[PDB]
Protein backbone atom coordinates (compact mmCIF):
# COMPACT_ATOMS: atom_id res chain seq x y z
CA UNK A 1 0.00 0.00 0.00
CA UNK A 2 1.07 3.39 -1.19
CA UNK A 3 -0.29 6.93 -0.91
CA UNK A 4 -2.49 8.20 -3.66
CA UNK A 5 -0.03 11.08 -4.26
CA UNK A 6 3.13 9.06 -4.96
CA UNK A 7 4.62 10.15 -8.27
CA UNK A 8 4.17 8.18 -11.48
CA UNK A 9 7.62 9.44 -12.54
CA UNK A 10 9.14 6.97 -10.06
CA UNK A 11 7.54 4.09 -11.93
CA UNK A 12 9.03 4.38 -15.43
CA UNK A 13 12.61 3.84 -14.23
CA UNK A 14 13.93 0.67 -12.55
CA UNK A 15 14.17 1.06 -8.78
CA UNK A 16 12.98 -0.42 -5.47
CA UNK A 17 9.33 -0.96 -4.56
CA UNK A 18 10.06 0.84 -1.34
CA UNK A 19 10.61 4.52 -1.89
CA UNK A 20 14.34 4.54 -1.15
CA UNK A 21 17.20 3.11 -3.17
CA UNK A 22 19.02 0.28 -1.40
CA UNK A 23 22.25 -0.23 -3.37
CA UNK A 24 24.79 -0.99 -0.64
CA UNK A 25 27.65 -1.83 -3.06
CA UNK A 26 28.45 1.90 -3.26
CA UNK A 27 28.94 2.23 0.51
CA UNK A 28 32.20 1.74 2.39
CA UNK A 29 33.16 -1.88 2.95
CA UNK A 30 32.57 -3.57 6.33
CA UNK A 31 30.64 -0.55 7.70
CA UNK A 32 27.23 -1.73 8.85
CA UNK A 33 26.16 1.59 10.36
CA UNK A 34 26.90 3.53 7.18
CA UNK A 35 24.91 0.97 5.19
CA UNK A 36 21.91 1.10 7.54
CA UNK A 37 21.92 4.90 7.42
CA UNK A 38 21.48 4.73 3.64
CA UNK A 39 18.38 2.53 3.95
CA UNK A 40 16.50 4.14 6.78
CA UNK A 41 17.39 7.64 7.98
CA UNK A 42 15.48 10.58 6.53
CA UNK A 43 17.92 13.39 7.26
CA UNK A 44 19.46 12.36 3.94
CA UNK A 45 17.58 12.56 0.63
CA UNK A 46 17.65 9.44 -1.58
CA UNK A 47 20.76 8.32 -3.41
CA UNK A 48 18.36 8.31 -6.38
CA UNK A 49 16.54 11.63 -5.82
Amino acid sequence: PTPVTSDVAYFQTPSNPRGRAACVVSCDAYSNESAERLLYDHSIPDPAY
Binding site: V4, S15, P17
Partner: protein, 49 residues
Protein backbone atom coordinates in the same frame (compact mmCIF):
# COMPACT_ATOMS: atom_id res chain seq x y z
CA UNK B 1 16.91 -20.20 -15.65
CA UNK B 2 17.00 -16.47 -14.91
CA UNK B 3 14.61 -14.74 -12.51
CA UNK B 4 13.51 -11.12 -12.94
CA UNK B 5 11.29 -8.98 -10.72
CA UNK B 6 8.51 -6.89 -12.21
CA UNK B 7 7.49 -3.62 -10.58
CA UNK B 8 3.99 -2.38 -11.08
CA UNK B 9 1.46 0.27 -9.86
CA UNK B 10 -2.34 0.38 -9.53
CA UNK B 11 -4.80 3.04 -8.40
CA UNK B 12 -2.99 6.39 -8.29
CA UNK B 13 -3.97 10.06 -8.50
CA UNK B 14 -2.39 12.75 -10.66
CA UNK B 15 -1.88 16.27 -9.25
CA UNK B 16 -4.04 19.32 -9.82
CA UNK B 17 -2.81 21.00 -13.09
CA UNK B 18 -3.84 18.04 -15.24
CA UNK B 19 -2.40 17.91 -18.74
CA UNK B 20 -2.53 15.90 -21.96
CA UNK B 21 -0.37 15.32 -25.01
CA UNK B 22 -2.40 12.78 -27.04
CA UNK B 23 -3.91 14.01 -30.29
CA UNK B 24 -6.44 11.18 -30.63
CA UNK B 25 -8.43 10.20 -27.56
CA UNK B 26 -11.99 11.45 -27.26
CA UNK B 27 -13.29 9.99 -24.03
CA UNK B 28 -11.83 9.66 -20.55
CA UNK B 29 -10.64 13.29 -20.06
CA UNK B 30 -13.33 14.32 -17.52
CA UNK B 31 -11.88 15.29 -14.11
CA UNK B 32 -14.37 13.26 -12.06
CA UNK B 33 -13.09 9.94 -13.41
CA UNK B 34 -10.95 7.64 -11.28
CA UNK B 35 -8.99 4.57 -12.35
CA UNK B 36 -9.24 1.59 -10.01
CA UNK B 37 -7.32 -1.00 -12.05
CA UNK B 38 -4.34 -1.34 -14.38
CA UNK B 39 -3.89 -3.62 -17.37
CA UNK B 40 -1.05 -6.12 -17.87
CA UNK B 41 -0.11 -8.10 -20.99
CA UNK B 42 0.63 -11.78 -20.41
CA UNK B 43 3.16 -14.20 -21.82
CA UNK B 44 0.60 -15.17 -24.48
CA UNK B 45 -0.35 -11.51 -25.16
CA UNK B 46 -3.76 -11.71 -23.45
CA UNK B 47 -4.43 -8.39 -21.68
CA UNK B 48 -5.72 -8.77 -18.12
CA UNK B 49 -6.87 -6.41 -15.37
Amino acid sequence: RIQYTYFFPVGLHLPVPRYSTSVSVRGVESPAIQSTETWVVNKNNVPLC
